Design a protein around this ligand. Structure first.
Ligand SMILES: NC(=O)C1=CN([C@@H]2O[C@H](COP(=O)(O)OP(=O)(O)OC[C@H]3O[C@@H](n4cnc5c(N)ncnc54)[C@H](O)[C@@H]3O)[C@@H](O)[C@H]2O)C=CC1
Ligand SMILES: Cc1cc2nc3c(=O)[nH]c(=O)nc-3n(C[C@H](O)[C@H](O)[C@H](O)COP(=O)(O)O)c2cc1C
Ligand code: SF4
Ligand code: SF4
Ligand code: SF4
Ligand code: SF4
Ligand code: SF4
Ligand code: FES
Ligand code: FES
Ligand SMILES: [Ca+2]
Lengths: 156, 439, 226, 139, 120, 225
């Protein structure tokens, strides 16, 4: 059972004010729902489709197309570590090994207490300060395997 | 290093504490003078011709001239609805120039889109931004609010009757969205499948309307041209490519960074005189000139000017001009496997060769990494290179995917030979059936 | 409009694309993602031919016959070695993830993918890695769903959404995990959803009413009726 | 060049001899994968061509085969004379170690050919079978 | 798997069968009859079988008193073992999901990845 | 007036170069085993004296055959429904030698006059319910409901009511109401049709027990059962 909140709905309509087609607010509507609830549940697709006036199949295809729109439940914090070519040169694998040792999970999985969700991600545009990790809203550069568990304790 | 405004049109107004420049400080340091001149004393066709004969080329990575792209907009007065899009995606690995461009100089981008929208008669403008540039989004939104409060945006800009509305469309994290037709499809709320050209977006782009898509750096180069003139821009460097470019070296160098250099600057000065050379205990092995989608080059190609024609004649591309250096400690098979894993997982799934041949190259490179390679794997990689070139796939994602693979096979084949250990085996034995022993 | 296919002159319609013009002349070009009723999209990359700039040209360039207009004075080659090799490579790439399913598939003997695999001359498998798999959906009493056999040619979504105007079928996912179906299990709501069994060139969408008492196409006694 | 390639066999000396004797427009050379020169001869010149082949310096001495073909359902008849039926004559010269296939085109109503028995006596049974199975009358 | 390849590859056309399906989803012959008065024992059906189900065994003693008794139904053909091919299983190769073999459990097949997965 | 049906299809003496048109493909199988359980003797092939088709594969189904009636599309190398491309003059156009079927009548030279019988507006009378027809692609046809695979796709038999009419009758959505037509009381569940005009009750035509002639008729004592 899903119901869009009043603030979510008003933000969605304000987003469709910005475009000449209401379909163009689908990505930002999914991002609004994701920001409010951590992820996009199954009924959120039909709710966004009903508000936007587009079929739910297109909303589901958009939500499954984009990697930053999560259609599966995640933890309270999402760690996104860069695994692209420059951070591979700078050694992201030590960072990934430290993350898997500290969190005791594989990439794409969630910690048993729902605190952290480990995810690989593409280049974060911070290659000169690599390797880079992107926790929920904060990007951390110049990573070392020793600083990983110190960095992870500041996200309760 | 001093940065005079005459030779550093983009980065001379950066602050030493890496803090953003807001409206008062930007306007104090010769801000919106080019926008004022273009919107008051210049016709849109005059601005288009000024950008055209200034020689401003596309800074996205293809080098198409911006004035000719603006000139192919339709001449019909009935098509009043027009769109200007800023490709602030910058999802290429090895590219970090747009992040520095709008994280601390947002008003330069705002002024550039204002000038380009007045030149293109674009009634609306969108900054298609990646979702990972949060600080850039905050700075751009604050700069848009400051320019709207100051009369630089909205209705009746400078009293000239020109109306322009600028928005920031924060993306949802997909690499293919940087492709301009895929950018238009993603802006319309659809899946970011690219479109076949012709028709080009200038004729029918966003929502069927005339649309022009330009990179952040091209729109940042625009106001310097409009404020200082064409003759200053053509006299920056004595090269074919006019103006400056954000170049820099990344990866285990002494100073991995970002500098603004004129075209024709050789890659050895960027590596040694600016990045300080390789780190201690590491020797230079290879480099990519323009990001993850470019061909690898060797030490012999380091004495080459960073122009489109010079790097193009060496079997590579200038690209985003942000070179990435590979030392001797990095295995080429692992590096190419990382590159192809990125390119295979960032496919949009539309067309067959990229979607179904990049995972094959990924699996072959994984087999070569652990020494489980079988004969014919490198021939398969070469055929995947040949059959994923330009014109074979629906867009240019897969040619850029296969450029590093073919350059590494060409220059470092002995590292790829080392992975082939097992004999070729595709079938298992079936009892009661004698196999066809092909000699 | 005058075209030259493999050195032979043909008179075609210049408003047509090269694929439909060459199929109207009796020539064989493999294709998946183009349909006469749906138009050209250039997705499957199977209809590749080699176009030359003029008559005295040897290099040429691989173009797509569904995306290339059959304009006057066109010079193309179908039986060119590079075009044949690329079409066989496209069939091979489609065959890397295909399940070993033809005996237990209702499209067997009636399959466009089978015909184009044989036509391109691809009969040797050198791909040795794993194949991707997909779960199936319940699409109602008329259409049976089997997503392992998909080649991602986008015919179903194009027909169902652009042509038939339906809403509940779509494409989901990413790079090589593209899924074609409903967002959730349920009956297909279009009154013309049964045409998916002929639109789909593979056995993803099949006639379940026929799949109950299934027999192959060669075993059927057919008649023209109303 | 592989042995299965389509050849017109215009380098055969019998083709040049027939060109010099009957003329270039008298018959049509067909490129096949049979390995033999296939010559479509007009019906009224069939006995003349048979006599000429029987009186060559290295003559074609054996009628290897003689039968018919129903060409009504044949769709791919490119480079061939118009025909509803056809009669083919396979003749072997052992001295040359060569052979030639003459073909006579027939309309559906005028299904009559001059008989070949005055040149080769095996044409008796071959023409009896051709009449039995195809209805082609041999005068 | 009642795929009817042997029936169409028979030059005599003396094989008749009908596909049926179990509740799990596996294909089997509802019936299977061979007119052995017509069969020329040429082995083309066995050569055409993609599951190695139909086989020609070393047995010639097949004489009969009535021609109607030369029509062997599925009860007279299905034997208790694998015959000449002791280990081949088609349903280990097929992509279709049946009982005891879900999606991705076949040979050279990976587990199915959902489109809702968090991995890029 | 029905004189055009002679040219709809050619008669039973039509041949393609002397042979009939094949109903089944050339690789049809099981001919000596389809009836072997009934009798080991192969029966006589069914003769078709009515039409030009034959009940066998010994016929013509060439894509270039001069005909308009095509039983099925097959070409060498094209076993899919894409063989219709081989069976057309141009792909996506018509059949090569014309599509089958002939129009019985041409367009008349002169037209009709204006129908002056403009009806009066719909007045909802008390106690009488106008039967608004509802058609369903799965269920309204007489023979299609007999198909057992349709019963899963056939909708349940409801009756449609306006919100105002339902509130006046005191009935909700899903409750059973009974109505008498021609002295026959039948009960149906209720949906609330918002777009249905008041004074009308919505019946699904062609269903089980609801004849299509009830469209436009009137209803009495429609009340909750
Ligand atoms: N993050 C980044 O900056 C990335 C940049 N790239 C760059 O992208 C480049 C490829 O870009 P594409 O747009 O796919 O190819 P392209 O070179 O065909 O197009 C580039 C620009 O030229 C314009 N253009 C070209 N021919 C035109 C014509 N006839 N009429 C009108 N406009 C025309 C297009 O509209 C577009 O704006 C590569 O060279 C690569 O360096 C690639 C990946 C990532
Ligand atoms: C796969 C692919 C990804 C691209 N990504 C970007 C990008 O992230 N940012 C960008 O400015 N251009 C990108 N481009 C290039 C654009 O197509 C286009 O050239 C650019 O957005 C505007 O051209 P400009 O250089 O004249 O400004 C990409 C091209 C391709 C083929
Ligand atoms: S090459 Fe094809 S599948 Fe790959 S990103 Fe481009 S259009 Fe999509
Ligand atoms: S869809 Fe075609 S190729 Fe795939 S299993 Fe079925 S018959 Fe075989
Ligand atoms: S399901 Fe069928 S029609 Fe749809 S994309 Fe896949 S192969 Fe094409
Ligand atoms: S062995 Fe008998 S049943 Fe099998 S194909 Fe030959 S004739 Fe038919
Ligand atoms: S015996 Fe073999 S060939 Fe015949 S239907 Fe069964 S599986 Fe197919
Ligand atoms: S490669 Fe990791 S931030 Fe760019
Ligand atoms: S038919 Fe042309 S690319 Fe698919
Ligand atoms: Ca009859």
């Amino acid at each position: 059972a899903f119901e869009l909140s009043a603030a979510e709905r008003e933000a969605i309509e304000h987003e469709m004010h910005h475009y000449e087609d209401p379909r163009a607010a689908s990505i930002e509507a999914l991002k609004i729902v994701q920001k409010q609830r951590g992820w996009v549940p199954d009924g959120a697709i039909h709710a966004i489709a009903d508000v936007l006036g587009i079929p739910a199949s297109d909303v589901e295809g958009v939500a499954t197309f984009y990697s930053q729109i999560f259609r599966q439940p995640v933890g309270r914090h999402v760690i996104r570590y860069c695994d692209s070519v420059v951070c591979h040169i700078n050694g992201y694998q030590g960072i990934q090994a430290a993350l898997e040792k500290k969190l005791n999970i594989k990439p794409g999985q969630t910690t048993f207490d729902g605190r952290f969700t480990l995810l690989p991600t593409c280049c974060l545009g911070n290659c000169d300060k690599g390797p880079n990790m992107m926790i929920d809203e904060d990007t951390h550069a110049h990573l070392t395997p020793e600083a990983i568990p110190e960095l992870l304790e500041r996200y309760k | 290093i001093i940065r005079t405004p005459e030779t550093h049109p983009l980065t001379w107004r950066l602050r030493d504490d890496k803090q953003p420049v807001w409206l008062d400080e930007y306007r104090s340091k010769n801000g919106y003078e080019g926008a004022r001149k273009a919107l008051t004393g210049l016709s849109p066709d005059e601005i288009v011709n000024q950008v055209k004969d200034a020689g401003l080329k596309g800074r996205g990575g293809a080098g198409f001239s911006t004035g000719l792209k603006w000139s192919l907009m339709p001449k019909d007065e009935s098509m009043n609805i027009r769109y200007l899009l800023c490709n602030a995606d910058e999802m290429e690995p090895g590219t970090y120039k747009d992040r520095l461009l709008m994280e601390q100089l947002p008003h330069l981008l705002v002024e550039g889109m204002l000038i380009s929208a007045f030149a293109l008669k674009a009634y609306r403008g969108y900054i298609f931004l990646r979702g990972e540039y949060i600080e850039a989004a905050v700075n751009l939104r604050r700069a848009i609010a400051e320019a709207t409060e100051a009369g630089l945006l909205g209705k009746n800009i400078m009293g000239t009757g020109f109306d322009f509305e600028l928005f920031v469309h924060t993306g949802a994290g997909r690499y293919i969205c940087g492709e301009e037709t895929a950018l238009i499809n993603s802006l319309e709320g659809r899946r970011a499948n690219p479109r076949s050209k012709p028709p080009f977006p200038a004729t029918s782009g966003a929502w069927g309307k005339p649309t022009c898509v330009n990179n952040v750096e091209t729109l940042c180069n625009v106001p310097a041209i409009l404020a200082n003139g064409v003759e200053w821009y053509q006299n920056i460097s004595k090269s074919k490519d006019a103006g400056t470019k954000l170049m820099g070296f990344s990866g285990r160098v002494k100073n991995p960074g970002l500098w603004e250099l004129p075209f024709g600057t050789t890659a050895r000065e960027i590596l040694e005189d600016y990045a300080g050379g390789m780190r201690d205990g590491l020797k230079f092995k290879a480099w990519q000139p323009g990001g993850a989608g470019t061909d690898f080059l060797t030490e012999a190609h380091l004495d080459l000017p960073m122009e489109f024609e010079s790097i193009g004649k060496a079997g590579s591309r200038l690209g985003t001009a942000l070179a990435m250096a590979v030392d001797h400690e990095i295995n080429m098979v692992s590096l190419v496997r990382n590159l192809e894993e990125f390119f295979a997982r960032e496919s949009c799934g539309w067309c067959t060769p990229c979607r179904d041949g990049l995972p094959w190259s990924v699996k072959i490179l994984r087999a070569l990494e652990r020494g489980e390679g079988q004969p014919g794997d490198i021939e398969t990689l070469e055929q995947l290179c040949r059959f994923l070139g330009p014109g074979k796939t629906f867009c240019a994602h897969a040619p850029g995917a296969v450029e590093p693979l073919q350059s590494a096979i060409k220059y470092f084949r002995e590292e790829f030979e080392a992975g082939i250990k097992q004999p070729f085996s595709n079938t298992h034995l079936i009892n009661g059936i004698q196999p066809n022993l092909l000699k | 409009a005058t075209i030259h296919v493999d050195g032979k002159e043909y008179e075609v319609n210049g408003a047509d694309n090269l694929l439909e013009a060459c199929l109207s002349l009796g020539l064989d070009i493999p294709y998946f993602c183009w349909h006469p009723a749906l138009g050209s999209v250039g997705a499957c990359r199977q209809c590749a031919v080699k176009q030359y700039q003029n008559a005295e040209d040897t290099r040429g360039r691989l173009v797509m016959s569904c995306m290339t207009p059959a304009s006057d004075g066109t010079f193309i080659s179908i039986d060119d070695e590079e075009a044949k090799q690329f079409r066989e490579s496209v069939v091979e790439w489609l065959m890397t993830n295909h399940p070993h399913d033809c005996p237990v598939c209702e499209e067997g003997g009636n399959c466009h993918l089978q015909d184009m695999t044989v036509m391109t001359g691809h009969s040797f498998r050198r791909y040795r890695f794993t194949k991707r798999t997909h779960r199936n959906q319940d699409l109602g009493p008329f259409i049976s769903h089997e997503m392992n056999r998909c080649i991602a040619c986008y015919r179903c979504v194009r027909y169902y959404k652009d042509y038939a105007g339906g809403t509940d079928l779509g494409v989901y996912g990413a790079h090589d995990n593209v899924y074609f179906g409903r967002p959730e299990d349920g009956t297909l709501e279009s009154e013309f959803s049964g045409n998916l069994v002929e639109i789909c060139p593979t056995g993803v969408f099949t006639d379940k009413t026929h799949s109950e008492r299934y027999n192959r196409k060669w075993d059927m006694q057919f008649a023209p009726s109303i | 060049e592989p042995a299965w390639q389509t050849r017109d066999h215009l380098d055969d000396p019998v083709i040049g001899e027939l060109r010099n004797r009957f003329g270039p427009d008298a018959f049509t050379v067909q490129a096949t994968r049979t390995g033999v020169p296939v010559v479509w001869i007009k019906r009224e010149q069939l006995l003349e061509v048979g006599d000429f082949l029987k009186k060559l310096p290295k003559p074609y001495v054996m009628l290897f085969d003689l039968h018919g073909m129903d060409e009504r359902l044949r769709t791919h008849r490119e480079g061939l004379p118009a025909a509803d039926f056809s009669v083919f004559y396979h003749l072997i010269s052992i001295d040359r170690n060569r052979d030639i296939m003459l073909k006579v085109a027939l309309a559906e109503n005028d299904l009559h050919v001059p008989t070949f028995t005055k040149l080769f006596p095996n044409a008796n049974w071959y023409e009896r079978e051709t009449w039995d199975l195809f209805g082609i009358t041999f005068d | 798997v009642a795929c009817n390849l042997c029936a169409v590859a028979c030059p005599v056309g003396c094989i008749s069968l009908q596909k049926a399906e179990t509740k799990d989803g596996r294909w089997y012959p509802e019936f299977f009859r061979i007119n052995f008065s017509r069969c020329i024992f040429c082995g083309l059906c066995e050569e055409a079988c993609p599951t190695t189900a139909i086989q020609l065994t070393p047995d010639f003693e097949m004489g009969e008193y009535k021609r109607q008794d030369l029509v062997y139904e599925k009860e007279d053909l299905l034997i208790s073992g694998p015959g000449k091919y002791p280990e081949y299983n088609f349903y280990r190769m097929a992509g279709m999901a049946i009982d005891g073999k879900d999606k991705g459990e076949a040979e050279n097949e990976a587990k199915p990845i959902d489109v809702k997965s968090l991995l890029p | 007036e029905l004189a055009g049906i002679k040219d709809a299809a050619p008669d039973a003496t039509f041949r393609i170069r002397g042979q009939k048109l094949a109903r089944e493909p050339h690789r049809y199988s099981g001919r000596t085993a389809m009836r072997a359980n009934i009798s080991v003797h192969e029966p006589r092939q069914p003769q078709d004296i009515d039409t030009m088709f034959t009940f066998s594969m010994e016929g013509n189904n060439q894509p270039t055959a001069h005909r308009s009636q095509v039983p099925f599309a097959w070409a060498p190398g094209w076993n899919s429904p894409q063989a219709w491309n081989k069976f057309q003059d141009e792909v996506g156009g018509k059949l090569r030698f014309g599509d089958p079927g002939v129009r019985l009548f041409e367009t008349s030279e002169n037209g009709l006059d204006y129908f002056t019988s403009v009806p009066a507006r719909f007045q909802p009378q008390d106690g009488k319910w106008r039967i608004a027809p509802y058609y369903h692609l799965f269920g309204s046809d007489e023979l299609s409901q007999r198909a057992p695979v349709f019963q899963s796709r056939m909708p349940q038999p409801y009756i449609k009511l306006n919100p105002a009419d339902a509130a006046k009758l005191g009935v909700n959505a899903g409750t059973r109401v009974s109505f008498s037509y021609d002295g026959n009381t039948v009960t149906l569940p209720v949906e609330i049709a918002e777009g249905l005009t008041a004074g009308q009750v919505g019946l699904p035509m062609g269903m089980s027990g609801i004849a299509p002639v009830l469209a436009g008729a009137h209803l009495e004592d429609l009340k909750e059962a």
